């Protein structure tokens, strides 16, 4: 048993008609101190999978090393390492297996594994420090579970709505959600977003920023009940 | 007296370890394989005797990779070779895990070195029945190595072992002389294909299958990769041509 020290907040995601999108801000909080700002919490594995991690950063960095090794080891004596290669479902089932840690009372702590898969199918599943797993058209961790899911479920309410959803529509919902969160959450304005499309492949966007924020109305609010 | 050759760690009256020497025999009796160090990487190639038409072509691979930058090829008892690579692989992971940076070729060499030497210390283990040629590119250059069952190993410009180690070595020595400036990754790949073809004469009875791999700071970005398709054919021909 431990307690998280440096942490990362929400990880939001959803799946559209041709792939899946996943995003996460670049903050590394230390208690209430927003200590680190260049933290990439989206780990791409291969070119068909991206792993979004939230929770204890130190444990995340460990999980990173685990993944890079999963890559290396899969290449060993494998002449089809770049062909018939790591699947998102493999990467996930592995990480999920690594329950355990909670079962040894030493969890971790922290995940949303997003990707496409070889047969074109979209993969989106969640796993946390308790070893609990589940899938949904949209998935968010921590705060995003409370504020992002509601928006993204508007969207793709059920299965279906997937084919009916375009990358633009989807990425828009994601980017809006990130703004919301920035408004209410241990969040940062700067974030990363990744799209894994069964055609365009993996698109990994860095340094995005929340834009188009409404703050103006604040000037009209004075006092807490005061006229000036 | 005699019998100094029945137990592995025993010293004979002249200071030798006969069991290790007998291991070498098993090595010399195996397929030929080589390694060519070039100006920014290394090339590996090995002979693959086609015992029959039943052998699915291109399948039964022999060259192995360690981590992402090390390439290993060996002559002798194949199973023993795999065993040595499995170790090397762990040996490498362990190094990276603690130091972050992927293991330097020299450092890696000694790891295999020490481990093999270890199997000549006790009579409860058998020495390795393989000679191994391995190498890669690291923080400062490319490195080529060859390891003997005795655990002995050195850095090479070119190296070869197996049935036609002499033909090979002969060829290699030519190259070293006719290229004091340094061969190129592209060049070495063909040159290698040739040397395997030449050295195949000491086994000309059976048909074989070529296999090459390389690690070049420029051609592969310092990563070990197998030579396939076009570049393979191009080299196969370059040999097929000079074999006549």
From Swiss-Prot, chain A:
The keyword rRNA processing does not apply. Transmembrane segments: none annotated. It comes from the Eukaryota. One of its GO terms (cellular component) is proteasome storage granule. Keywords: Cytoplasm, Nucleus, Proteasome. Disulfide bonds: none annotated. It is found in: Cytoplasm; Nucleus. It holds the Pfam family Proteasome. InterPro entries: Ntn_hydrolases_N, Proteasome_beta4, Proteasome_bsu_CS, Proteasome_sua/b, Proteasome_suB-type. PANTHER family: METALLOPROTEASE TLDD, PROTEASOME SUBUNIT BETA. Belongs to the peptidase T1B family. Non-catalytic component of the proteasome which degrades poly-ubiquitinated proteins in the cytoplasm and in the nucleus. It is essential for the regulated turnover of proteins and for the removal of misfolded proteins. The proteasome is a multicatalytic proteinase complex that is characterized by its ability to cleave peptides with Arg, Phe, Tyr, Leu, and Glu adjacent to the leaving group at neutral or slightly basic pH. It has an ATP-dependent proteolytic activity. PRE3 and PRE4 are necessary for the peptidyl-glutamyl-peptide-hydrolyzing activity. This is Proteasome subunit beta type-7. The lineage of its organism: Eukaryota, Fungi, Dikarya, Ascomycota, Saccharomycotina.
From Swiss-Prot, chain B:
The keyword Metal-binding does not apply. This is Probable proteasome subunit alpha type-7. The alpha and beta forms are probably products of the same gene with different post-translational modifications. Present with 12000 molecules/cell in log phase SD medium. One of its GO terms (cellular component) is proteasome complex. GO terms for molecular function: mRNA binding. Belongs to the peptidase T1A family. It comes from Saccharomyces cerevisiae (strain ATCC 204508 / S288c) (Baker's yeast). The keyword Cytoplasm applies. It is found in: Cytoplasm; Nucleus. Its main location: cytoplasm. GO terms for biological process: proteasomal ubiquitin-independent protein catabolic process; proteasome-mediated ubiquitin-dependent protein catabolic process. The chain holds residues 5 to 248 of 288 of the full protein. The proteasome degrades poly-ubiquitinated proteins in the cytoplasm and in the nucleus. It is essential for the regulated turnover of proteins and for the removal of misfolded proteins. The proteasome is a multicatalytic proteinase complex that is characterized by its ability to cleave peptides with Arg, Phe, Tyr, Leu, and Glu adjacent to the leaving group at neutral or slightly basic pH. It has an ATP-dependent proteolytic activity. Coiled coil: none annotated. The 26S proteasome consists of a 20S proteasome core and two 19S regulatory subunits. The 20S proteasome core is composed of 28 subunits that are arranged in four stacked rings, resulting in a barrel-shaped structure. The two end rings are each formed by seven alpha subunits, and the two central rings are each formed by seven beta subunits. The catalytic chamber with the active sites is on the inside of the barrel. Keywords: Acetylation, Cytoplasm, Nucleus, Proteasome.
């Amino acid at each position: 048993t431990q307690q998280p020290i440096v942490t990362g907040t929400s990880v939001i995601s959803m799946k559209y008609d041709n792939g899946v999108i996943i995003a996460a801000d670049n903050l590394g909080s230390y208690g209430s101190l927003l200590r680190f700002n260049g933290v990439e919490r989206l780990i791409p594995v291969g070119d068909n999978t991206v792993v979004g991690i939230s929770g204890d950063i130190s444990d995340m960095q460990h999980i990173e090393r685990l993944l890079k090794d999963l890559v290396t080891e899969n290449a060993y004596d494998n002449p089809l390492a770049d062909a018939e290669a790591l699947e998102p479902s493999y990467i996930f089932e592995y990480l999920a297996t690594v329950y355990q840690r909670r079962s040894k009372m030493n969890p971790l702590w922290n995940i949303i594994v997003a990707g496409v898969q070889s047969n074109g199918d979209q993969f989106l599943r969640y796993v946390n420090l308790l070893g609990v797993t589940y899938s949904s058209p949209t998935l968010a961790t921590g705060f995003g579970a409370h504020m992002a899911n509601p928006l993204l479920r508007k969207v793709v309410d059920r299965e279906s709505d997937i084919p009916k959803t375009t990358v633009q529509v989807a990425e828009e919902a994601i980017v809006n959600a990130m703004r919301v969160l920035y408004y209410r959450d241990r969040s940062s304005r700067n974030f990363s977003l990744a799209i894994i499309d069964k055609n365009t492949g993996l698109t990994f966007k860095k340094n995005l920023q929340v834009e188009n924020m409404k703050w103006d109305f604040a000037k009209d609010i004075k006092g807490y009940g005061q006229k000036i | 007296g005699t019998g100094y050759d029945l137990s592995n760690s025993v010293f004979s009256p002249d200071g030798r370890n006969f069991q290790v020497e007998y291991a070498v025999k098993a090595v010399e009796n195996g397929t030929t394989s080589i390694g060519i160090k070039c100006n920014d990487g290394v090339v590996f190639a090995v002979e693959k005797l086609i015992t029959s038409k039943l052998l699915v072509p291109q399948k039964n691979v022999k060259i192995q990779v360690v981590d992402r930058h090390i390439g290993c090829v060996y002559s002798g008892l194949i199973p023993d070779g795999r065993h040595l690579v499995n170790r090397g692989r762990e040996e490498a992971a362990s190094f990276k895990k603690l130091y972050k940076t992927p293991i330097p070729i020299p450092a890696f060499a000694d790891r295999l070195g020490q481990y093999v030497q270890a199997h000549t210390l006790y009579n409860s283990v058998r020495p390795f029945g393989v000679s191994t040629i391995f190498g890669g590119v690291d923080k400062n250059g490319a490195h080529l190595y060859m390891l003997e069952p005795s655990g002995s190993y050195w850095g090479y410009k070119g190296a070869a072992t197996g049935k036609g180690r002499q033909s090979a070595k002969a060829e290699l020595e030519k190259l070293v002389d006719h290229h004091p400036e340094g061969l190129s990754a592209r060049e070495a790949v063909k040159q290698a294909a040739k040397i395997i073809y030449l050295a195949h004469e000491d086994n000309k009875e059976k048909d074989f299958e070529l296999e090459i791999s390389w690690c070049s700071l420029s051609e592969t970005n310092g990563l070990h990769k197998f030579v396939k398709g076009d570049l393979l054919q191009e080299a196969i021909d370059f040999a097929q041509k000079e074999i006549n």
